[PDB]
Design a protein around this ligand. Structure first.
Ligand code: CDL
Ligand code: CDL
Ligand code: CDL
Ligand code: PC1
Ligand code: PC1
Ligand code: PC1
Ligand code: LMT
Ligand code: LMT
Lengths: 82, 149, 122, 188, 52, 89, 117
């Protein structure tokens, strides 16, 4: 059964084996988010997307750090400024 | 005699899963109501929520400079006072204004309140995640202070 | 005293009747519908009931799968077939050569494929 | 600490002794083999049945006891049901005190009890009245329904879909530990 | 209101003839087949590589 | 298995049996040093009847009368119908 | 019918059946909360056991290391012959004490790592 010398393993099991479903769920959610990101990239984007990055806020009116783009009021002959 | 002709290993798997599920239902039925519901739904659910929130979202330890800037939590229950060092989980789209409103309970906040991390002031129209990434990488301790100067 | 205690008993029994009615209702509504069939019941009987039946056995923490292995101590003349004897004669000692070879291979793999760490270069 | 004394001469004595029979006057009352069933009196016969005939074609076993009046009431209609459906299944008549290991095997807790078996774990349906509301007719109707169900399932899916379950690896050892001897496992 | 639970709901299983040991002794043949096939495949590959 | 010359001896067999029984008892039995007896709100049949001898008598007389039978067929858990009838009586 | 006489007494009210569906005197959320509290409080035994186990495991290490450091201080400080003659016996006593601590630890560890099943 068990014993005082197995307290380490008992505690570890009781506190960790219930977390394995959540760990697997987190892994699956990460896979799905990656799939959606890749589908969006294939569809097309104005500015690029960093796949393995936490957040990608860049758009036509926003930098890759969440700030407004400088020198973006007018239009440019070569198209997008990026 | 292993296996039978005409039957498939997938059918065997299905039968085994059915047996397991029926046995689980029987064992749950013939059990104490005081323990089974808790141990099977409430601890798993809470553990799942906590682990998912920790491993998916990103949190920040919030502090406030002065006591006069503390919010009014006298009405809401289970928290009748502000404590500095509070862990706050946010979404990647959250801004400084949204954070301030969440802190002050959607009520009138003091004047000229601003957020800083490692001594560096954030703009109110800035994403918290990216601002932290830039100024305090892997040190999300935020401070709310009053910028009169 | 007398009257109050007897009325206490009477109200206790009223509460008992209420509890019994709700018990009947709970059962015949929920439990008679959710009751398992019995096909997936527990495939065992408690050791106390087995002991009362005179059926309990305690021994053989181990087992012998094959009858060839079960009847060895009873045959008395051919515990092992000739082919089995010839096969057994190959394991009179442990193979330190095989031990050494496997240990060297495993150490090589573990050290130069699984336990590589960086080192400075000047 | 828990213990039960081993046994007594009374417990080990013959559970089914003979009793005096009355003359042909007490039988005169207001309410006044079998060629279709098999009376079982040996666990050897019961195991032979359950392990070969139950795999060939289904079996229906009536577990009874002499003290029970429901068993006497149910005997005759069971014999009629046997005469009816003896072509599709086998029919056995077991006494719990004469062959207890057969009752422990079928997991019977009350008498009388019908047990429809096929494969020994593929389809085991037990019919009884643990409350005391049903009657012989209701029990026989439930038995007919169970026999119909098992026959339909056996015909379903080219004879398959009825395979033994836990008995494939348990050998009914948790139910009756004496099967270790049958399996040849040691007991030291 | 009486007992609602059976004895096996509380009492521990047999010590030496338990559910898992019976299950694993029943699965032994399939596991032997599986692992023997895997080991034979690996050994045949290694031998085909080593002999030449 | 022990490293004795004869593990199949009657002494070894009886020692193993006694150890078996003592282990099972120390694990399952209700004692002052309980292992498994814990978090008890709904008791099983055996412990229930061992602690409440009044109910064993009532539940037994009702079984013998409601169903003319032997104590050897005493059910593990009685039906709620029987319990309700007992309460009414 | 056999059981109709008893089943006729089983006639419930609408409120009775609603109360049964809700499980008033059979779910006992107070009992569930008591169980949760007791189960969470029962985690102190693991900490007690691990503390005892670690102490009994490190006892010989302590006897071998810290008393050794003390002996080494004495050796580093002493120069004469009489004190050294007298200190040799202290060293031997430390040997015996180490073996005693090892025996004690062996006993307590075979007690703490003994499982019935
Ligand atoms: C979201 C909300 C979540 C909340 C939950 C919601 C519901 C979800 C389902 C429940 C999930 C929790 C499962 C708990 C079960 C165990 C604990 C318990 O309380 O059980 C008591 C419950 C009642 O038991 P009981 O009342 O005390 O006595 C009755 C016996 O159990 C009756 O026994 P039996 O006679 O009927 O049969 C014997 C039984 C024996 O069960 C037992 O008695 C104990 C089982 C041992 C458990 C721990 C074993 C750990 C072993 C270590 C593994 C080391 C592997 C090393 C490999 C090295 C090789 C490289 O056989 C088994 O079922 C065990 C099989 C698996 C053992 C595998 C071990 C390795 C052997 C491999 C064998 C070959 C594979 C199988 C092939 C089968 C044919 C296809 O047990 C059971 O009902 C059956 C045992 C459980 C079997 C598993 C059932 C499926 C579980 C699925 C888990 C997946 C979760 C992930 C979900 C996805 C999330 C993202
Ligand atoms: C790339 C694909 C994936 C990778 C796969 C790579 C290739 C492997 C494929 C799979 C296996 C081969 C398949 C084809 C086989 C075809 C030929 C054939 O059929 O027969 C085999 C073939 C011929 O068999 P045979 O015809 O019956 O005749 C055999 C001879 O008569 C001789 O019989 P014997 O009775 O005389 O046995 C000789 C034995 C002699 O007996 C002994 O084993 C005594 C010594 C045991 C040492 C302690 C064992 C600890 C085990 C830990 C294992 C895990 C360690 C972690 C792994 C990484 C280690 C760095 O020596 C050994 O061979 C065993 C060596 C064990 C490894 C040594 C590990 C280091 C020990 C360190 C101890 C010192 C500690 C202090 C260090 C400080 C030093 C300053 O010989 C073998 O290959 C033997 C297989 C060796 C397997 C290991 C022994 C079993 C131990 C089990 C340990 C637990 C493992 C758990 C497994 C995973 C969980 C399920
Ligand atoms: C007294 C005893 C006498 C002894 C005599 C000795 C003299 C005899 C000559 C042999 C001398 C021993 C040579 C040992 C290896 C070289 C030394 C060494 O280990 O340096 C470390 C060095 C470590 O690499 P690293 O980049 O610095 O860092 C490693 C980290 O793991 C990197 O970290 P990471 O995170 O990037 O992980 C990447 C990892 C990722 O790995 C993985 O993710 C999984 C690995 C694969 C698992 C299996 C998955 C299944 C898919 C693969 C299927 C393979 C089976 C085929 C299946 C066919 C069906 C589709 O990638 C790999 O490590 C690839 C490993 C390549 C293994 C495959 C090569 C064949 C293996 C069999 C060779 C047999 C030689 C026997 C020699 C005779 C000894 C008696 O090794 C290498 O650079 C790679 C070795 C490339 C092979 C070179 C082979 C030529 C040299 C040997 C000459 C003889 C060739 C004979 C060929 C026979 C036909 C096969
Ligand atoms: C992948 C890493 C695994 C490494 C660790 C595990 C050990 C490695 C060895 C393989 C593990 C699996 C061994 C299975 C042995 C059982 C064989 C057997 O015959 O069992 C009886 C079953 C039931 O048979 P049956 O009852 O239908 O018919 C035969 C009846 N008898 C036995 C009486 C003759 O047979 C099978 O159908 C095969 C089952 C094994 C195949 C599935 C593997 C199980 C492991 C996965 C568990 C999850 C199941 C759900 C999967 C869903 C997939 C989408
Ligand atoms: C490398 C890792 C190696 C480690 C192995 C890792 C894998 C295996 C780890 C297993 C060890 C942990 C197992 C602990 C299991 C404890 C959980 C448990 O038994 O529950 C407590 C309850 C407690 O019951 P109890 O309270 O009556 O009795 C428990 C014990 N005593 C008597 C001492 C109190 O157990 C059960 O009764 C049910 C268990 C089976 C059900 C399991 C959950 C799934 C349920 C799904 C069915 C849902 C039906 C819903 C229907 C609703 C309407 C009715
Ligand atoms: C359930 C399991 C219970 C487990 C209980 C565990 C408790 C006991 C654990 C104590 C382990 C201590 C051993 C390590 C310390 C010695 C290190 C060493 O070898 O030095 C190198 C020694 C001494 O070398 P040296 O001093 O001559 O010179 C080189 C030393 N170095 C390398 C360190 C610089 O190597 C030897 O040559 C020793 C050979 C003689 C044999 C010595 C062993 C006996 C002394 C230790 C006994 C301890 C166990 C007592 C158990 C009593 C139980 C009743
Ligand atoms: C039966 C199969 C079950 C397999 C497991 C499947 C996963 C189940 C849980 C999915 C949770 C979905 O719910 C969703 O979770 C993610 C992650 O917390 C949240 O999303 C959060 O993280 C992601 C990543 O930055 C962003 O959307 C955003 O930063 C934030 O909102 C959503 O606000 C919430 O709506
Ligand atoms: C003679 C042929 C015998 C056949 C043997 C084939 C075995 C091949 C298995 C190789 C698996 C190695 O797996 C790999 O191990 C190395 C350590 O060395 C790890 O290496 C890791 O740590 C090192 C050191 O910090 C860094 O280079 C880096 O962070 C990362 O590569 C990898 O994270 C792991 O993926």
């Amino acid at each position: 059964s068990t014993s005082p010398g197995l307290a380490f393993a008992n505690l570890t099991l009781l506190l960790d084996v219930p977390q394995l479903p959540a760990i697997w769920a987190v892994n699956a959610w990460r896979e799905l988010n990656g799939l959606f990101t890749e589908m969006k990239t294939l569809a097309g984007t104005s500015d690029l997307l960093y796949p393995s990055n936490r957040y990608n806020p860049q758009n036509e009116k926003t930098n890759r750090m969440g700030r407004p783009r400088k020198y973006n009021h007018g239009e440019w002959m070569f198209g997008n400024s990026y | 005699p292993l296996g039978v002709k005409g039957r498939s290993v997938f059918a065997g798997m299905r039968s085994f899963i059915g047996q397991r599920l029926g046995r689980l239902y029987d064992s749950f039925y013939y059990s104490q109501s005081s323990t089974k519901y808790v141990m099977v739904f409430l601890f798993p659910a809470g553990i799942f929520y906590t682990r998912f929130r920790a491993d998916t979202k990103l949190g920040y330890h919030v502090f406030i400079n002065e006591e006069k800037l503390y919010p009014d939590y006298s009405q809401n229950y289970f928290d009748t006072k502000w404590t500095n060092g509070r862990k706050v989980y946010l979404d990647d789209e959250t801004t400084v204004e949204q954070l301030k409103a969440q802190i002050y309970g959607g009520k009138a906040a003091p004047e000229n309140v601003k957020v800083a991390c490692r001594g560096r002031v954030f703009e109110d129209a800035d994403n918290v995640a990216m601002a932290v990434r830039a100024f305090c990488k892997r040190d999300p301790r935020l401070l709310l202070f009053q910028d009169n100067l | 005293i007398q009257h109050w205690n007897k009325s206490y008993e009477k109200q206790v029994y009223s509460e008992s009747v209420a509890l019994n009615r709700t018990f009947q209702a709970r059962n015949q509504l929920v439990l008679d519908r959710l009751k398992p069939s019995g096909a997936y019941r527990l495939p065992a009987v408690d050791y106390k009931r087995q002991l009362s039946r005179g059926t309990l056995v305690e021994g053989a923490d181990f087992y012998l799968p094959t009858a060839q292995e079960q009847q060895r101590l009873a045959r008395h003349f051919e515990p092992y077939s000739e082919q089995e004897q010839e096969e057994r004669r190959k394991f009179r000692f442990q193979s330190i050569s095989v031990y050494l070879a496997v240990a060297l291979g495993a150490s090589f793999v573990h050290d130069y494929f699984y336990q590589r760490r960086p080192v400075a270069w000047c | 600490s828990f213990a039960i004394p081993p046994a007594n001469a009374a417990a080990l004595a013959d559970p089914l002794p003979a009793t005096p029979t009355p003359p042909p006057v007490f039988e005169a009352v207001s309410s006044a083999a079998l060629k279709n069933v098999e009376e079982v009196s040996t666990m050897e016969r019961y195991e032979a049945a359950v392990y070969e005939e139950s795999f060939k074609k289904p079996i229906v076993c009536l577990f009874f006891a002499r003290f029970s009046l429901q068993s006497k009431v149910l005997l005759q209609p069971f014999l009629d049901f046997a005469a009816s459906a003896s072509n599709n299944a086998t029919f056995f008549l077991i006494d719990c005190d004469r062959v207890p290991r057969a009752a422990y095997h079928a997991r019977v807790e009350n008498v009388p009890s019908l047990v429809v078996m096929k494969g020994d774990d593929a389809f085991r349906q037990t019919i009884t009245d643990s409350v005391g509301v049903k009657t012989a007719g209701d029990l026989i109707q439930e038995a007919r329904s169970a026999l119909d169900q098992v026959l339909r399932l056996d015909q379903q899916e080219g004879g398959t879909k009825l395979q033994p379950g836990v008995s494939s690896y348990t050998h009914h050892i948790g139910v009756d530990n004496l099967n270790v001897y049958r399996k040849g496992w040691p007991v030291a | 209101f009486g007992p609602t639970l059976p004895d096996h709901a509380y009492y521990g299983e047999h010590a030496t003839y338990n559910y898992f040991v019976l299950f694993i002794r029943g699965m032994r043949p399939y596991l032997e087949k599986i692992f023997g096939d895997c080991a034979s495949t690996i050994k045949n590959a290694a031998v085909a590589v080593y002999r030449p | 298995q022990p490293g004795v010359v004869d593990p199949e001896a009657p002494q070894e067999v009886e020692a193993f049996k006694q150890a078996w029984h003592s282990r099972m008892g120390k694990f399952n039995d209700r004692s002052d040093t309980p292992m498994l007896y814990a978090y008890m709100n709904e008791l099983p049949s055996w412990e229930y009847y061992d602690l409440h001898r009044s109910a064993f008598l009532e539940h037994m007389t009702y079984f013998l009368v409601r169903t003319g039978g032997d104590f050897r067929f005493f059910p593990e858990m009685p039906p709620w119908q029987w319990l309700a009838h007992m309460e009414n009586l | 019918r056999p059981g109709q006489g008893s089943n006729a007494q089983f006639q419930t009210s609408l409120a009775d059946k609603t109360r049964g569906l809700l499980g008033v005197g059979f779910l006992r959320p107070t009992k569930m909360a008591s169980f949760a509290a007791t189960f969470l409080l029962n985690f102190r035994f693991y900490f007690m056991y691990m503390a005892r186990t670690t102490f009994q495991a490190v006892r010989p290490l302590l006897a071998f290391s810290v008393f050794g450091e003390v002996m080494k201080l004495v050796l580093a400080t002493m120069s004469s012959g009489l004190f050294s003659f007298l200190f040799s016996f202290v060293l031997a006593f430390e040997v015996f004490y180490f073996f005693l601590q090892c025996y004690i630890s062996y006993t307590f560890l075979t007690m703490f790592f003994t499982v019935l099943f």
